[PDB]
Design a binder for this molecule. Structure first.
Ligand code: CUA
Length: 119
């Protein structure tokens, strides 16, 4: 179990700078640091290449959230203080909706993101 401090994740560590969310970690491998908030995803959109292995590293800045990529079997709970890891290779270019699968308050019904898979 991989633990982080939710009260400092916006200020120190790999989720602190939103411009640095996508990091190449092998010839055809990218790690993506996703930070869920009430009520949006950081970064948005997430842009990745077709056929590369993606390693998502997902945590929460406040309350329990969900992270589900429509059209795949990616569906994880996202807890403050914990890192959820998911590995996946996207074979078809195009756009996929990201949906929050855990009730999280006022604007839960509007918490959407996007992943763009480039040709
Ligand atoms: Cu985040 Cu519902």
């Amino acid at each position: 179990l991989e633990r982080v401090d939710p009260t400092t994740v916006r200020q120190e560590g790999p989720w602190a700078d939103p411009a640095q969310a996508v990091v190449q970690t092998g010839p055809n491998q990218y790690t993506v640091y996703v930070l869920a908030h009430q009520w949006y995803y950081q970064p948005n959109p997430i842009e990745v290449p077709q056929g590369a292995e993606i390693v998502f590293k997902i945590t929460s800045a406040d309350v329990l959230h969900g992270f589900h990529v429509e059209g795949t079997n990616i569906n994880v709970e996202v807890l403050p203080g914990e890192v959820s890891t998911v590995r996946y290779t996207f074979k078809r270019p195009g756009e996929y909706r990201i949906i929050c699968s855990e009730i999280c308050g006022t604007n839960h019904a509007f918490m959407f993101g996007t992943i763009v898979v480039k040709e």
